[PDB]
Symmetry: none
Subunit: 150 residues, 4 copies
C-alpha cells in the first residue's frame, strides 16, 4: 500500500493541530485558575478582617464588611464556574492529543508521537502547579472561615 | 401560633442534623478516596527507576480505578451538599419565622444550631482541602519524575 | 594583606544561610503551634457535646480530631527535620565567628555572634509558645476525659 | 460458643494486666524525665544568676554540668518514647479486646475494659501535662539565659 507515508503526513497535521488546540485551552485554563485563586485570597482576607472586628463593636462595620463578603463570594463562585467549564474543554483537548499521539505511533510517525507525549506531560505539569496553588488557597479560606466562627 | 413555629424550628433542626451527618460522611468518604489515590501516586513514583513496564502498568490500572472511585464519591458529596444548603436555608428561614411572632428562644437556639453545624461542616471541608492539596503535590512529583526517568 | 576580607565573606555567607534556615524553622514551629491550638479547640468542642447528644455529633467531631492530630504529627515531623538543617547553619556561623576572631576581623566576629544569639532567642521564644500550646492541649484532653468518666458512673 | 467466652475472658484479663503494667512503666518514665527537666531548669537559673561579677571558671563549671544534664534529659526522653509506643500497643490491644467482648455477649467484661482504658488514658495525660509545664518553664529559663 502506498498510503503509508500519506498517513504519516496526515497524522502529523493532526498532532500539530491538536497540540495548538491543547496550548490554547491550557493557557485559558491556567488564567481561569489563577483568577479563581486570587478571588479566594481576597475572600480569605475579608474573613480574617471580619473576625478581627468581633469584640466590642456595633453593627455598621460588621454589616458592611459582611456585605463585601457576599459580593466577594459571588465573585469566587462565578470564577469557580468559569474554571469548571474551561476544564472540560481542556480535558477534551488532552484526550484528542492523546489519541493523536497513539495514531502517530500506530502509523509509524513515531517522532510526532513522542513530541505530542512530551507536550501533554508538560501541559499537565503546568496546570497541576497552578491547581495546587488553588488547593492551598482553598485550605487557608477554610481555616479563615473556621476561625470566624467564634 | 408559637406552637406551630416551634414545631418548624424543631423539625427543620432535626432535618438539618440528619443532612449534615449525611454530608459529613460523604466528605470523609471523599477524603479517604483522595488519601488512597495520593498513596498510589507516591508508590508509582517510587517504582519509577527500579521497575519496568508490567509492574508499572498494573499499578497504573489501580490508579485509574482510584479516581473512578474518587470521582464517584465527589459526585455523591455534591448532590448531598445541594440538599444540605436547602436544609440550612430552611433552618435560617425558620429561625427568622421564630423571630417574628416573638418565639425568641426557639429562634436563638436555631441560629446557634445553624452556626454550630456550619463549623462542623467547615472543619471536615478543610481536611478535604488538605487532602486535595497533598494529592496535587503527589501528582506533580509523579510528572516531574516521569519526564526525568 | 588579606584573609580579613575572605573571612568576612565567610561570616556573611554563613549569616545568610543562618537567616534562611531560621525563617523556615520559625515558620515550621508556628505552623505546628497553630495545629496544637486547632486540636485543642476540637477537644473542647467534643467535651461541650458530652451529655446531651446522640453519636452523630460526637462521632463526626471525633473524626475531625483524628485528622487534626494526624496534621499535628505531620507538622511536628516537618519542624524536626527543619531543625536539623538549622543546627548545621548555627554550627557553621559559630565557627565562622571564631575564625573571624582568630584572624583579627573583630567586627565581622561581633556581628556574627550577635546574629547567632539573636536567632537562638527568636527560635527559643516560639518554642516556648509551642510548649504553652502543648500544655493547654493536654489540659483540654484531661478535661474531656474527666467529663467522659463522670458522664458514665 | 459453648467455650468461646472463656477464651475471650482470658484475653480481657491478660490485656488488662498488660495495660496496667505498661501504664505504670510509662508514668515512671515521664515523671523521671520531668525531674530531669526540673534539674536542668535549676542549673540554668543558677548559671544565669552568675553572669556579671563572676569569672568564667565556675560559670564554665556549671555550664559543663548543663551539657551533661541535657544528655540525661535526652536519654530519658528516648526511653519515654520507646515505652510510649509499647503503651499505645497495649491500649490498642485492650480496646480490641473490649470490642471482642461485646460482639460475643460478655459486655460486663466490656464495660470494665472501656472504663479501664479511659482511666489509664486520664492517668497518662495528667503526668504528661506536668511534663509540658516543666518543659515550658525550661524554655523560659533558657530565654532568660539569652545573655542577660
Amino acid at each position: 500500500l502506498s498510503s503509508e507515508a500519506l498517513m504519516r503526513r496526515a497524522v502529523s497535521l493532526v498532532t500539530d493541530s491538536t497540540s495548538t488546540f491543547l496550548s490554547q485551552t491550557t493557557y485559558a485554563l491556567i488564567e481561569a485558575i489563577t483568577e479563581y485563586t486570587k478571588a479566594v485570597y481576597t475572600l480569605t482576607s475579608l474573613y480574617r478582617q471580619y473576625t478581627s472586628l468581633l469584640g466590642k463593636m456595633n453593627s455598621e462595620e460588621e454589616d458592611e464588611v459582611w456585605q463585601v463578603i457576599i459580593g466577594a463570594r459571588a465573585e469566587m463562585t462565578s470564577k469557580h464556574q468559569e474554571y469548571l467549564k474551561l476544564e472540560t474543554t481542556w480535558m477534551t483537548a488532552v484526550g484528542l492529543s492523546e489519541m493523536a499521539a497513539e495514531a502517530a505511533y500506530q502509523t509509524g510517525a513515531d517522532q510526532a508521537s513522542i513530541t505530542a507525549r512530551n507536550h501533554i506531560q508538560l501541559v499537565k505539569l503546568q496546570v497541576e502547579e497552578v491547581h495546587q496553588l488553588s488547593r492551598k488557597a482553598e485550605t487557608k479560606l477554610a481555616e479563615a472561615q473556621i476561625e470566624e466562627l467564634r
